[PDB]
Amino acid sequence: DKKSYAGLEDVFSDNKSISPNDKYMLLVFGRNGCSYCERFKKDLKNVKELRDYIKEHFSAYYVNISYSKEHDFKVGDKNNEKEIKMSTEELAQIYAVQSTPTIVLSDKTGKTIYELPGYMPSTQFLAVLEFIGDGKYQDTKDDEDLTKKLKAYIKYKTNLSK
């Protein structure tokens, strides 16, 4: 339900239609009775820098796997967008969701860039979001180099926060 993210309608668009819509895409898989999902939402509410950053750079969706809805999922570039109707369960399966919260960050074509299978405090999480949102990920050689640069960037932002 929309109740899954009550008060965060400014951040999350209706998940009946999921697409990057010419922004980076942020998909959060959550569920009922999930204390880390609750902590994640409180961070989004209360850390204005995090909230503003997401609203500026991301099309964001909160998918509650405690329920089953139909989602119109639209990815691909401008020349060829693929639109598929899928269930909550099929959407989670595509992303291989195994735990909640799972956070998926994708580019404007809907290509997965990075995934966090768990909660991360707001300082570190905003660093991950900037690494993707400012395009810094683009200058990396591979998955290993991206991970290494991202981890560097997070420590840097951690030093900065103190």
Side-chain angles (χ1 to χ4, degrees):
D1 204 81
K2 270 82 186 157
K3 218 161 62 191
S4 310
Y5 55 94
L8 284 163
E9 304 79 10
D10 59 312
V11 172
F12 295 112
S13 311
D14 195 319
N15 67 29
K16 72 186 183 178
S17 325
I18 294 165
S19 194
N21 283 314
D22 200 49
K23 300 168 81 188
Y24 291 98
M25 186 170 65
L26 165 66
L27 297 193
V28 182
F29 294 88
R31 66 171 179 85
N32 290 354
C34 165
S35 81
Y36 281 111
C37 300
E38 297 305 311
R39 278 190 66 176
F40 173 80
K41 286 184 284 181
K42 290 180 165 69
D43 283 356
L44 294 208
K45 278 180 184 196
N46 289 349
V47 184
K48 189 159 188 305
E49 201 183 342
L50 175 60
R51 198 174 187 156
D52 290 337
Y53 195 83
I54 299 175
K55 281 149 61 168
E56 250 295 286
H57 303 86
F58 295 82
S59 298
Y61 303 91
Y62 192 92
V63 171
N64 189 338
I65 70 171
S66 294
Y67 304 107
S68 185
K69 309 170 73 277
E70 275 186 48
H71 313 274
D72 296 309
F73 182 70
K74 180 201 281 172
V75 298
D77 69 60
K78 229 172 165 207
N79 297 319
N80 49 235
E81 277 161 327
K82 323 277 170 194
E83 303 180 67
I84 308 176
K85 297 183 87 67
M86 67 199 308
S87 73
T88 297
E89 291 84 5
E90 293 168 329
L91 181 73
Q93 190 171 62
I94 280 178
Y95 286 96
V97 174
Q98 259 134 230
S99 57
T100 58
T102 291
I103 299 153
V104 184
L105 305 180
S106 303
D107 75 25
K108 312 182 173 191
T109 76
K111 199 204 174 230
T112 301
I113 298 155
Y114 212 72
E115 162 180 336
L116 317 167
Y119 172 81
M120 188 176 300
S122 52
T123 296
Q124 291 71 38
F125 184 50
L126 173 60
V128 178
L129 291 174
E130 285 164 0
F131 195 77
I132 275 79
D134 292 344
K136 309 191 213 291
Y137 76 100
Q138 289 175 22
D139 270 277
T140 48
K141 293 179 179 179
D142 43 52
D143 297 313
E144 195 164 8
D145 189 46
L146 194 157
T147 302
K148 173 176 142 293
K149 300 294 164 49
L150 176 53
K151 269 163 180 183
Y153 189 74
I154 292 159
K155 310 263 213 192
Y156 162 60
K157 289 282 272 166
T158 305
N159 283 338
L160 188 60
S161 64
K162 287 157 184 162

